[PDB]
Design an enzyme around this catalytic site. Structure first.
Site, PDB file in Angstrom:
ATOM      1  N   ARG D  51      36.414  39.037  87.648  1.00  0.00           N
ATOM      2  CA  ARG D  51      35.972  38.921  86.262  1.00  0.00           C
ATOM      3  C   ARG D  51      35.875  37.474  85.812  1.00  0.00           C
ATOM      4  O   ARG D  51      35.113  37.153  84.899  1.00  0.00           O
ATOM      5  CB  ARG D  51      36.909  39.685  85.325  1.00  0.00           C
ATOM      6  CG  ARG D  51      36.779  41.178  85.441  1.00  0.00           C
ATOM      7  CD  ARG D  51      35.504  41.595  84.736  1.00  0.00           C
ATOM      8  NE  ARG D  51      34.976  42.866  85.213  1.00  0.00           N
ATOM      9  CZ  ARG D  51      33.856  43.413  84.761  1.00  0.00           C
ATOM     10  NH1 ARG D  51      33.151  42.792  83.829  1.00  0.00           N
ATOM     11  NH2 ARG D  51      33.435  44.573  85.241  1.00  0.00           N
ATOM     12  N   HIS D  93      34.884  37.848  76.501  1.00  0.00           N
ATOM     13  CA  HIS D  93      34.354  39.210  76.398  1.00  0.00           C
ATOM     14  C   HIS D  93      35.088  40.210  77.274  1.00  0.00           C
ATOM     15  O   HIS D  93      35.207  41.377  76.914  1.00  0.00           O
ATOM     16  CB  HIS D  93      32.866  39.242  76.756  1.00  0.00           C
ATOM     17  N   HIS D 120      38.801  48.688  76.943  1.00  0.00           N
ATOM     18  CA  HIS D 120      39.064  47.297  77.301  1.00  0.00           C
ATOM     19  C   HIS D 120      38.555  46.359  76.203  1.00  0.00           C
ATOM     20  O   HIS D 120      39.053  45.240  76.060  1.00  0.00           O
ATOM     21  CB  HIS D 120      38.465  46.955  78.676  1.00  0.00           C
ATOM     22  CG  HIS D 120      36.978  46.796  78.684  1.00  0.00           C
ATOM     23  ND1 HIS D 120      36.119  47.873  78.719  1.00  0.00           N
ATOM     24  CD2 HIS D 120      36.197  45.690  78.697  1.00  0.00           C
ATOM     25  CE1 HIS D 120      34.871  47.436  78.737  1.00  0.00           C
ATOM     26  NE2 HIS D 120      34.893  46.116  78.723  1.00  0.00           N
ATOM     27  N   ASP D 191      25.468  39.490  78.464  1.00  0.00           N
ATOM     28  CA  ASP D 191      26.442  40.135  79.336  1.00  0.00           C
ATOM     29  C   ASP D 191      25.771  40.865  80.479  1.00  0.00           C
ATOM     30  O   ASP D 191      26.181  40.715  81.632  1.00  0.00           O
ATOM     31  CB  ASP D 191      27.314  41.123  78.571  1.00  0.00           C
ATOM     32  CG  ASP D 191      28.388  41.744  79.453  1.00  0.00           C
ATOM     33  OD1 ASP D 191      29.187  41.004  80.066  1.00  0.00           O
ATOM     34  OD2 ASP D 191      28.418  42.988  79.554  1.00  0.00           O
ATOM     35  N   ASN D 238       8.303  41.165  82.462  1.00  0.00           N
ATOM     36  CA  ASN D 238       9.622  40.619  82.751  1.00  0.00           C
ATOM     37  C   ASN D 238      10.740  41.544  82.281  1.00  0.00           C
ATOM     38  O   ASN D 238      11.744  41.709  82.970  1.00  0.00           O
ATOM     39  CB  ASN D 238       9.794  39.240  82.109  1.00  0.00           C
ATOM     40  CG  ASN D 238      11.002  38.495  82.646  1.00  0.00           C
ATOM     41  OD1 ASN D 238      11.367  38.641  83.813  1.00  0.00           O
ATOM     42  ND2 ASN D 238      11.638  37.702  81.790  1.00  0.00           N
ATOM     43  N   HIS D 256      27.931  55.295  93.476  1.00  0.00           N
ATOM     44  CA  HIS D 256      28.050  55.569  94.902  1.00  0.00           C
ATOM     45  C   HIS D 256      29.037  56.697  95.187  1.00  0.00           C
ATOM     46  O   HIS D 256      30.107  56.750  94.579  1.00  0.00           O
ATOM     47  CB  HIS D 256      28.479  54.302  95.634  1.00  0.00           C
ATOM     48  CG  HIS D 256      28.283  54.360  97.115  1.00  0.00           C
ATOM     49  ND1 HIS D 256      29.308  54.650  97.987  1.00  0.00           N
ATOM     50  CD2 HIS D 256      27.184  54.156  97.880  1.00  0.00           C
ATOM     51  CE1 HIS D 256      28.851  54.623  99.226  1.00  0.00           C
ATOM     52  NE2 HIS D 256      27.564  54.326  99.188  1.00  0.00           N
TER      53      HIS D 256
HETATM   54 FE   LIG Z   1      31.209  42.235  81.226  1.00  0.00          FE
END
Ligand SMILES: [Fe+3]
Ligand SMILES: Nc1nc2c(ncn2[C@@H]2O[C@H](COP(=O)(O)OP(=O)(O)OP(=O)(O)O)[C@@H](O)[C@H]2O)c(=O)[nH]1
Ligand SMILES: Nc1nc2c(ncn2[C@@H]2O[C@H](COP(=O)(O)OP(=O)(O)OP(=O)(O)O)[C@@H](O)[C@H]2O)c(=O)[nH]1
Ligand SMILES: Nc1nc2c(ncn2[C@@H]2O[C@H](COP(=O)(O)OP(=O)(O)OP(=O)(O)O)[C@@H](O)[C@H]2O)c(=O)[nH]1
Ligand SMILES: Nc1nc2c(ncn2[C@@H]2O[C@H](COP(=O)(O)OP(=O)(O)OP(=O)(O)O)[C@@H](O)[C@H]2O)c(=O)[nH]1
Ligand SMILES: [Fe+3]
Ligand SMILES: [Fe+3]
Ligand SMILES: [Fe+3]
Lengths: 422, 430, 384, 389
Positions: D51, D93, D120, D191, D238, D256
């Site tokens: 992170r 963040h 979170h 983000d 784009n 997955h």
């Molecule tokens: Fe993030």
């Protein structure tokens, strides 16, 4: 404000004055001069010419000057100065002959050993003819430059000194380091063709100019203003010299590449007497004579290769048969390389020495090529603004009887001339 | 095995047979003919020539068959078949004239309208001439080829059918679609110049040939063997057409680019009667006549531009000044664009008469400047996929003007709008 | 098959799969390759695990390619698997933060014993095969445990596993290496450094050669440029990343912090025997447990015996690192008495004729720098 | 004097001294030990990244977005002060992420403490508050021209959202700032741009999207009865390219079969050893220590109470995963779902211009297969609960 689409630099905006210079028979003349010269014949990707490179140098010069200016306003960089560095980087390569470096350095020393001639000198002489014949001086004054003083500044950036420099005083010394920098080996010209030849040759170019320009600053060193780099961003520089070294070792100094250069050079010498180029006052100049008149030199481009190739004149038979051999791929054979453990004027005599060094070989079968190939100031975060020659021999006779003979004449030539053993 | 350093494909290994063809006055001629032709004067990056392109098409030709050969042995893909496809993609563009598409697309129709000439027809004539004058035919049988059948197969891959194809049988029909594919527009030629033009022009390209070839297979469709792609690699195909669209709208259809194309064409027409090119049997050929003889055509490249430009002869006075205007950027002015939608397309024979038509198009309201045909340039621009599963395996017409005054152009614009109006093309957009 | 950013798709033959799925091999996922370097270059999170997979892959890539190009080389089906497994397990012995451990830590704690990550790799490999039963699986796919297991150990550490006629095999993992190619290519990828070298092509033009009466691996003469860009990648990577001023400082802080913890931290090994941090290198049962966890164990420890050890890592996180003085076991006592980090670091064939031919030291810091300067003269070193 | 960091994605990141002060803290440095994709690492060896290097990118990108609008549109009134809040917002963040990221707040805590409403995002505010309080950043903030009372709320709002015009930190004319780090309507924010570009890099997936171009020709506009952020009509190609990647990473990486199996494996072992792990989210001083370290502390433990947790973690290393049963809800109720017999059932969850929920089931026993037993129960469970067949 005109913009041109570039693969390397993206969008290049051109201030109307620059455009006036670009749109001229003297600058458009650069669309017909291959950058690597003979190199196109070894690397099929490298067709590109001096014209599109020139726009590159002009762009980068503008990128470096404008960027130093915003970062350090106290440098007192005027908008007038910006065009002058741009125009200089733009016209730096006006004087290049057919196949670029093959001409000034290989051909002329052979055709006219007598004359001290460089492409930088041509760029100055051509620049004047560009201005005079297209009447650019009023356009210069129209956009706020002073032609008498600035044209001198520009010529000095290209060729050098005519405190040495008359165009600007010593407080703007760093400006001379932008387009052509001899001491450091860092100029916006190299950044272009370093990045530009890699794009075409198929080599990854490690140097990032956008980042170097980001962290570039003018600083005081040894009581002189020079352009310097950040200490943390030294790694960017090391990749430049390796990119600089890769490009030399692989492409510019290619075994076959400089061989085709000599064959072409060889045909030009064979064609010099017979081919005529019209100049000023309707005076006819030969190929070697053209560099004298800029009016005639404007006409001399890579066109000359094909006119010999396509020629029907029997006067051009020997020169043409040499160019035919290039296209059928029956080249000169490589004999050997050596080092001086030589001057351009003296290139003339080099074949004569090898034939008489002791199957019979004459000079007419001998070609000998001469190839010619820290000091960076830095600032810190806490205290910013505080600081070879290779010689090769080839042979015109390909058979394995004449070629072995060539090598030993060569090996003794090296021994008596006290070079390294091949 | 010679290896060539290519910027796009990295490494092109060239089989000894291929190399013998390349090192010839007929093939090396492609080094002096720019791919995009006139586009160089609008894009400084697009310097590249037909030569370095040809080698790519040859390389891609080889990559495709070998992969089909390795993936599907029942296909009977021989080492002989591979060389022939390679030779076809390699010699695909031999017949291109000076500045490529300008020659057989704009110039020849103007110079000789009666005459039906294509560059595809040119490559076949050149290919035959390469072999005869260089004695390549004996070299082929030495490396396992059959001159009688293969030269026909190769020529057919290039021009097409002279079951139509005599060089190879119908069970190997898929081979004809590799170099020249008329139906969908997916062939190794597209892939090379798609990647190479983008490389030089500075356009973002999403298509990956390396992946497309990976998931390529031969399949039965309509009781006929064709080339197909994976259903999963369908998105990738779309990336090719996104690129295909960019290259056209942006590069090939640039307003000024085709203007500079028309300017060069114009100087050529004016210099055609006067310029001589020596051919076979000491026969002298003009610029438009050269396409007949291959001996003379061998010499005809982008050089002819420089030969006119550097010429001193007063007979070439008008021809040199058209080229002069290019260097000074005193170009022809764009008047307008239109399309023949619905109505039958324009044909190449009639290109000659089109400026005569617009000059004699009565503009509704009378204007102070009257224009003749010589001031009008009128350009004509011209522009099905199968899938398998994992478990179950336009015409554009523009007008330009030679006179640039702002009063002189408006008359032209009104003439054009009238020309479209009477001839029922679309109304020009302001 | 495994998805790799560098090597793309790596095909895994079940024998390899069995080796990988082990507490001994899957253990290397917790050893940062650059070690302290992660604290200077944020991209370099990568570990020895995915590196090992790279080397095994490249190793397999080299032999089979030689096998097809030169069937006459006598390339056995065993050779393909052994070199893969050799390149695969080459880095098993690496400790916490890799080289920081073998290069600095063991020499300080137990100066006497010579233990290297290479020597470690065999002892772990030995603990691995025996304890997870790979020996039956090896012979199942055409291997011979007595002869082949030694061959792998040989590539890792003329030779009894393979004779002198299969000499070309030994130059592949440990020499120009398939190993070098991975971490040269792998580190450029994460650090953001230009990697000019292309291995796929070196492999394209690699050949077996007789030179000086020996079968060795050679390169094509035309593809000589490819070699030069690698040494540049080799030189660039050292100058920038591996020999980084702050990078090697942070390794030393960690090295010292591990020391304040050496006597106090215990890890259970074979026979429920308690081993210290420096002692683990002896027992392989215990060594599997020593990973980068040990770093956070000091940081998260509540124990006061490790108060001094913890206060250093705290000092690290607040970014109050040691200050650099100058460059030029017994060594710190040496500078103290004047009136310290130690860093240490081709055949070609032709187309026409193939098969032929540093010490650094770390306003009290100003005084120390002056104290240091005498020490260089003292031991006859260079002036900073 | 602006310190520069070498980033693989963005090249070089310039950091304003304050950002650096925030970063060099026990609370921020905590992000060096939290794997980004979490479970994805045992399936993708390239995805080692944490992170930490992601946070700096978002911080970097955040600064890139606001400044571009300010220089392009000075009348928008973006102060050099406004920019820092967004940088700090983008930088902090991801402060609240637990071990292996999303596995923690969205696959574990609902099982461990169904009662508790925890995200979170809610955590990052608590972590951000304690960071400043325990590191004395507040005076440093006032030192560089910020006003802590109004700005800490503005940042907290950028991260979690509003704590009628709800937001108390900034007025209605500065609405665009709230879309930059966190965009609820469109899903286009700096983000997404980092981890989209960052995960592809490590996973080895081709990315068509260019943020440098999208940021370049992006502008703030008065439409949707609101000041909002927009893109050019031509740069639809784009924008469309971002969407191919977002789904690619989802279809390939995040969703997955095996990846989500290992997430539940880790989750079950965590429940098995369970201030404690589930209780830690309450206290930030304790939560600061809670990292990917806990995986290793379970794995290497000798304590007999954690034996089964180790034997499950043993099961991970030997590659004996749960067997996948099939594919076909609120947070309180995840608990009852397997009961609805050791069954694990995972629940997976996932614009301007100018001129799903999937449920999988795994089984702890492969052998006695009779995996069909799991399959037969499932076909009935979906039919009975009137889900998809
Ligand atoms: Fe993030
Ligand atoms: N024959 C030929 N070679 C080309 C051409 N374009 C580039 N080349 C390169 O130029 C070189 C040809 O010169 P030669 O000396 O005859 O090549 P060579 O004898 O095979 O020697 P090597 O460089 O070792 O392959 C080749 O290496 C090619 O890679 C071309 O159009 N024809
Ligand atoms: N002037 C000029 N433009 C060039 C040149 N080479 C490429 N170009 C590009 O090609 C285009 C040529 O169009 P121009 O007619 O010269 O410029 P324009 O803006 O399109 O039209 P005008 O400036 O009004 O004549 C320009 O937009 C340039 O980007 C060149 O050598 N000179
Ligand atoms: N076996 C194994 N796979 C790994 C490892 N690291 C990453 N992987 C990846 O994880 C995936 C392995 O899937 P597995 O579940 O182990 O094998 P599977 O046959 O797909 O599924 P199962 O047979 O049910 O276990 C592969 O795609 C590998 O690329 C590892 O250390 N061991
Ligand atoms: N403080 C800090 N530095 C980092 C971090 N990650 C990478 N770095 C790099 O590591 C170096 C930290 O060493 P310092 O002692 O702070 O170096 P500095 O002299 O203060 O700053 P520089 O002159 O820019 O190197 C910085 O130069 C950063 O480039 C980080 O998370 N925190
Ligand atoms: Fe230059
Ligand atoms: Fe083509
Ligand atoms: Fe290694």
């Amino acid at each position: 404000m005109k913009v041109i689409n570039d693969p390397i630099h993206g969008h290049i905006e051109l201030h109307p004055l620059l455009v006036r210079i670009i749109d001229t028979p003297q600058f458009q003349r650069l669309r017909y001069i291959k950058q690597l010269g003979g190199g196109y014949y070894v690397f099929p990707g490298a067709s590109h010419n001096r014209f599109e490179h020139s726009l590159g140098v002009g762009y980068l010069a503008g990128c470096l000057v404008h960027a130093l200016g915003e970062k350090q306003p106290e440098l007192q960089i005027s908008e007038r100065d910006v065009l002058c560095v741009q125009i200089a980087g733009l016209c730096h390569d006006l004087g290049h002959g057919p196949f670029s470096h093959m001409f000034d350095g290989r051909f002329i020393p052979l055709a006219r050993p007598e004359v001290k001639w460089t492409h930088e000198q041509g760029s100055v002489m051509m620049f004047e003819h560009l201005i005079n014949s297209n009447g650019i001086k009023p356009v210069m004054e129209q956009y706020g430059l002073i032609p008498e003083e600035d044209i001198c500044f520009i010529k000095e950036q290209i060729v050098g000194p005519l405190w040495p420099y008359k165009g600007r005083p010593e407080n703007k010394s760093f400006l001379y380091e932008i387009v052509s920098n001899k001491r450091n080996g860092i100029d916006v010209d190299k950044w272009d063709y370093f990045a530009r030849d890699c794009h075409h040759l198929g080599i990854q170019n490690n140097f990032d100019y956008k980042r170097f320009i980001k962290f570039a600053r003018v600083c005081e060193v040894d009581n002189e203003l020079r352009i310097c780099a950040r200490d943390k961003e030294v790694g960017n520089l090391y990749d430049m010299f390796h990119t600089r070294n890769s490009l030399h070792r692989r492409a510019y100094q290619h075994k076959v590449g400089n061989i085709i250069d000599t064959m072409i050079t060889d045909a030009f010498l064979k064609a010099d007497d017979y081919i005529e180029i019209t100049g000023a006052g309707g005076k006819k100049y030969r190929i070697s004579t053209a560099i004298d008149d800029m009016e005639a030199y404007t006409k001399l481009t890579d066109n000359i290769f094909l006119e010999i190739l396509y020629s029907t004149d029997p006067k051009l038979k020997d020169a043409r048969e040499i160019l035919k051999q290039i296209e059928y791929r029956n080249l000169f054979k490589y004999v050997g390389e050596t080092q001086p453990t030589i001057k351009r004027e003296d290139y003339e005599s080099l074949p004569k020495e090898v034939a008489s060094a002791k199957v019979k070989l004459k000079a007419e079968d001998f070609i000998v090529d001469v190839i010619n190939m820290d000091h960076v100031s830095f600032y810190c975060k806490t205290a910013p603004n505080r600081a070879e020659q290779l010689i090769r021999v080839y042979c015109k006779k390909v058979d394995r009887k004449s070629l072995y003979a060539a090598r030993q004449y060569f090996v003794q030539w090296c021994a008596d001339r006290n070079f390294t053993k091949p």
